[model samples]
Target: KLHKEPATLIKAIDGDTVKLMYKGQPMTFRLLLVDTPETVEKYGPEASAFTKKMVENAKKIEVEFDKGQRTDKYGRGLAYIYADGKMVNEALVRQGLAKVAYVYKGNNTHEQLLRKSEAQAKKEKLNIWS
Candidate 1:
């Protein structure tokens, strides 16, 4: 089973990072199993814009943590973000704004699903794949 909790968006740092209010505390989150380009890199701004749009527009937001390590070295929580019942992490991969990456051992809760979405995006030559 997955551990999930309701969260409120504080800010979208970039395509794969965000600040949120989780469990009555402010925290930073790094989207799990995905990575987007830096803001200065190619297509970075677009990805950031997309993330910001999605989170800001969602009425409710949720986060799901992996079974292994929960936080990264920087102390940011590594999680899968859900916006209005949609998985934003998967959405980004499907949209080609992000790529499936940083898949460490024991933390691949949705690897297959994410990889499937990435395959579709790559086949279609969408965004990063293009």
Candidate 2:
């Protein structure tokens, strides 16, 4: 199956990347529309922990991809992660812990949604902005 298929969460690599078990194979995914602080940057651990907390507690993990690039130069699959129907990307932004990341060349309906959440985060000054 493609990125649209459900994948089991094996590990979270940071705020925006994770290790997924897809079809008994290990795959790393970089979340498509959300980017949290770097691991060494300020608030990075908090962002990573926030992501880890949600995925670790999820009873189910689902992933969806944009029609654009499936992998970055590093070969990490680009996807949207959903835990039990709750969008992880959206949650990160809504809590003001992440920003709207990159926009690929093709259709970007997801980008639009993330932008609004990012705006709300900026307005609220919730984390790094705090």
Candidate 3:
């Protein structure tokens, strides 16, 4: 099961992290199912750029959570980011800007879909896969 909450993305912290306002409170959400290059690593700039572009055009953004844990150890919301009906996590992997993270504690609802997209990206050798 999934629950969604409307939010505004205030900043892109990294390829997989974003600052947002949920219910008027500032929160940081780590995009689930995708991990891109860190800001200090190779492909970092491109990944960050891709992530920024992903949300820049969204007319609406929302955080999707599973019935299980909602936050990570760092207290950041662990979520799938939906921007204008597109799942940013899937888009990242599909575009080869990120790799499937699959590091959640329990059942990850979108695991299959994310892995499928990543596989297609790998097969096509898009972006980082190249």
RMSD of each: 0.8, 2.1, 1.2
Query: Each prediction's Cα lDDT score?
Result: 0.93, 0.85, 0.87
Can you write out model 3's per-residue Cα lDDT over 1-130, one digit (the tens) per residue? 5877899979988899999999999999998878899988888888888888878778899899876688989999988899988898898899898998756787478889999999999999998899
TM match of model 3 to true structure? 0.94
Which structure among the candidates has the greatest lDDT?
1
TM-score of each: 0.97, 0.92, 0.94
lDDT of 2 at 129: 71
lDDT of 2 by residue, 35-56 (tens): 7899999889998999999999
Q: Please, what are the lDDT tens digits per residue for candidate 1 over residues 1-130?
A: 9967999999999999999999999999999999898999999998999999999999999999988899988999989999999999999999999999968657898999999999999999999999
User: In model 1, what are the clashing residue pairs, if there are any?
Assistant: none
Relative to the true structure, candidate 2 has a C-alpha RMSD (angstroms) of 2.1
